[PDB]
Amino acid sequence: ADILPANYVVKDRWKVLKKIGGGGFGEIYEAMDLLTRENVALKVESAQQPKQVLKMEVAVLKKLQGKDHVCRFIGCGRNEKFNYVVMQLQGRNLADLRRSQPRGTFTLSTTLRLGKQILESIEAIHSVGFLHRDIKPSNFAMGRLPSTYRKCYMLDFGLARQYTNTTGDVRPPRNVAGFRGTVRYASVNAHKNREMGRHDDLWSLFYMLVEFAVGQLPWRKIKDKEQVGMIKEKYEHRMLLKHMPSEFHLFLDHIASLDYFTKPDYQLIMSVFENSMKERGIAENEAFDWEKA
Numbered sequence: 001a002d003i004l005p006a007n008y009v010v011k012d013r014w015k016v017l018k019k020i021g022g023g024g025f026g027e028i029y030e031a032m033d034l035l036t037r038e039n040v041a042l043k044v045e046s047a048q049q050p051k052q053v054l055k056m057e058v059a060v061l062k063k064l065q066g067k068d069h070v071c072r073f074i075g076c077g078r079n080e081k082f083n084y085v086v087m088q089l090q091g092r093n094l095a096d097l098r099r100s101q102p103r104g105t106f107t108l109s110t111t112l113r114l115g116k117q118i119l120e121s122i123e124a125i126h127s128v129g130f131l132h133r134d135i136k137p138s139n140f141a142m143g144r145l146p147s148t149y150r151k152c153y154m155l156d157f158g159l160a161r162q163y164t165n166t167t168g169d170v171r172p173p174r175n176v177a178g179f180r181g182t183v184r185y186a187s188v189n190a191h192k193n194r195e196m197g198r199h200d201d202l203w204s205l206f207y208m209l210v211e212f213a214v215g216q217l218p219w220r221k222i223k224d225k226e227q228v229g230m231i232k233e234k235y236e237h238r239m240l241l242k243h244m245p246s247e248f249h250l251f252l253d254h255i256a257s258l259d260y261f262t263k264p265d266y267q268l269i270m271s272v273f274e275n276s277m278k279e280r281g282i283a284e285n286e287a288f289d290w291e292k293a
């Protein structure tokens with residue numbers, strides 16, 4: 001049983017059209033906003049379920065408003081049966097969008113531009129004191145509107161966590177953190193059940209961009225968490241670099257050297273992308289791979 005049936009109308013305003021996944025430890029729905037007459041995204045989680053993440057998820061989404069790469073907050077509410085958030089609906093996610101490409105790879109031209117845009121999302125969420133912790137292609141979507149189809153968007157903040165404190169300083173890490181995110185893109189640290197940091201989000205971005213450029217990561221097959229963990233740790237990452245632009249050596253090297261407590265040099269990563277496009281003569285307003293005829 002889904003949490004909501006089709007044609008359930010939340011708070012007399014949002015009519016459930018269908019499930020689309022896909023959170024979040026909670027289900028996500030395409031819905032019609034009967035007031036504004038637009039389709040919207042509606043994410044609910046059951047109110048009798050141990051981990052109730054959605055309270056802060058609203059708070060992150062709230063603090064982020066005005067930043068690019070975030071969905072516009074539409075509404076939220078709580079009732080004895082479930083909690084819900086309504087926000088702007090978006091186009092196809094990058095995971096689906098990648099598999100649509102003939103050899104499972106995008107070009108570098110797409111990879112780099114998406115890289116730059118996903119990176120901004122990471123920096124933005126960090127900049128308000130939150131780790132994402134679930135950075136993966138299926139958590140990024142292109143726009144569905146004329147004005148937005150070029151823009152890439154961060155979708156779900158279900159696994160987010162505040163890494164700052166009262167004085168906004170970097171809270172002490174925990175004894176063990178349970179790791180409950182997507183196995184394939186998780187950093188070595190997340191595997192070892194350690195407390196995640198800003199750096200760990202960039203690790204995912206790293207692995208993502210390799211899959212985008214190459215079509216596969218080494219450990220793509222293995223479903224078993226711990227095996228992936230072993231394979232990642234013993235693996236010589238400098239080999240993943242082998243098909244990327246050569247300037248990626250700086251990206252790998254910078255994140256390899258970060259830990260929980262040290263702030264990333266986002267600019268440094270940004271420059272890797274921007275130089276890599278400059279040298280490959282790649283413009284900002286070029287067509288993405290999926291608009292290719």
Ligand SMILES: Clc1ccc(Oc2ccc(Nc3ncnc4[nH]ccc34)cc2)cc1
Pocket residue numbers: 020021022028041071087088089090091093095096138139141155156
């Ligand atoms: Cl491997 C895989 C896993 C799951 C999967 O379905 C997904 C279904 C839905 C989403 N999320 C969204 N999609 C579009 N607009 C959105 N607005 C806010 C959230 C959101 C994300 C993914 C597709 C592929």
